[PDB]
Ligand SMILES: [Gd]
């Protein structure tokens with residue numbers, strides 16, 4: 183796809199070179215334009231490669247004298263839009279506006295160019311492969327280029343500010359996505375001055391078709407300067423007492439009013455790295471901290487203590503599993519057998535068995551509750567693990583009633599997934615809070631690396647030992663008696679957790695002594711470079727990423743409790759405007775001191 187526009191751009195410059203009209207429009211040769219138009223007559227409605235006219239070419243390369251000649255000899259080329267799919271809708275006005283050619287925009291509105299002609303070309307879309315996104319209307323182009331003179335000059339000739347594009351975005355939404363944040367704020371105020379002036383149907387209330395007001399889009403897109411500037415409209419200073427200044431906050435589009443209309447939900451669910459800084463701002467950081475200090479932090483410990491007791495319940499049901507002897511003379515064929523199955527399905531022989539039967543019941547009603555609260559549908563694995571645990575618990579009771587050999591298989595999987603999920607609640611303890619995010623964000627880029635390497639090193643050295651020790655007998659050292667144990671023993675050797683094969687009575691093969699020296703070296707070099715490369719995330723900027731991501735998790739988890747829990751507890755944050763001078767809106771009282 184990228185080569186197409188590269189081809190069509192090289193194709194355009196070829197057609198400009200071929201057509202002497204389009205060449206004179208690109209080179210601003212007024213001497214040749216009159217020779218081509220008045221003397222030896224040519225097609226003045228000539229269409230270029232990109233569906234352009236000679237006027238569109240004269241507007242690209244800022245050439246005013248050529249454009250005026252093209253309009254004095256054919257004033258209908260102004261209404262002419264670009265016809266190609268890449269520029270479907272662009273007019274000669276859009277090119278002059280985005281080039282900030284005020285004299286050409288002035289002359290184009292004299293001819294009466296449509297200030298409402300959309301530009302639906304593919305290069306005008308809000309896509310990553312396009313370097314910019316200025317919208318579709320000429321009013322939106324002047325707002326993005328930072329030319330306040332063209333903006334009002336377009337409104338003078340009937341430009342509509344309510345004009346939404348394909349994505350249902352007004353000119354306000356488009357400025358929020360722009361890079362030059364420090365200059366677009368004055369442009370944002372200039373556009374609002376032309377509003378209707380009534381409290382209803384304001385331009386700041388017109389939502390993006392993704393359900394986003396311009397204020398809401400600022401926080402989602404991580405636009406701090408626009409969020410701060412948009413916040414001036416929604417805060418009421420109460421009084422000024424020396425350095426102290428008690429101010430009131432609107433809390434309308436913030437907090438959690440509507441289901442998905444809440445902004446806090448949008449900030450924690452977005453993948454935008456910049457959005458995590460919005461909840462650190464002075465309307466939100468007061469809110470989220472009050473929602474946590476009370477009603478947030480305590481309820482997280484209640485659910486945690488309940489889950490800790492629920493798992494220690496199921497743990498006891500496993501350590502006190504059913505009992506039964508071997509009941510088979512099987513421990514002689516393949517005399518390495520070791521099993522003593524404790525699996526009989528008894529019926530209510532309970533001097534102390536019903537104590538775990540209710541524990542088996544508690545483990546089931548808790549697992550079906552866990553399944554019926556998380557499957558009806560950052561903290562990711564610590565909620566995918568719980569549904570897999572409750573899946574293993576339900577398979578554990580399915581492992582019963584069939585009495586299969588692998589009774590312990592789904593039960594041992596549930597015993598580890600259920601416990602290691604307790605450090606999910608570690609994200610709300612100050613100390614190991616950021617620790618849990620450190621071990622979590624390390625499973626991706628710093629765990630799969632050096633394991634694909636370690637796995638390839640084992641695949642090499644482990645299999646060699648099998649060949650070396652498939653000749654000798656396993657009665658002696660035996661670390662590699664079959665190919666699976668040839669791999670598993672060397673894996674343990676890679677982490678030095680095994681003492682290394684060493685027998686000093688017999689004579690070891692001539693290749694083991696050489697290969698293990700090379701193993702002890704490479705298994706430690708790849709163990710040290712795993713330590714150093716992993717470290718490389720200890721910058722002073724990471725000191726925030728260690729903390730403000732944990733706070734983002736605490737803020738995200740604080741929103742998790744407020745949605746599902748009932749309304750008898752956790753009252754709405756702030757104080758309602760009703761029964762006060764305000765009106766049925768909830769406000770936060772925050773005061774500060776300027777030094
Ligand atoms: Gd032996």
Ligand SMILES: [Gd]
Pocket residue numbers: 680681
């Ligand atoms: Gd040892």
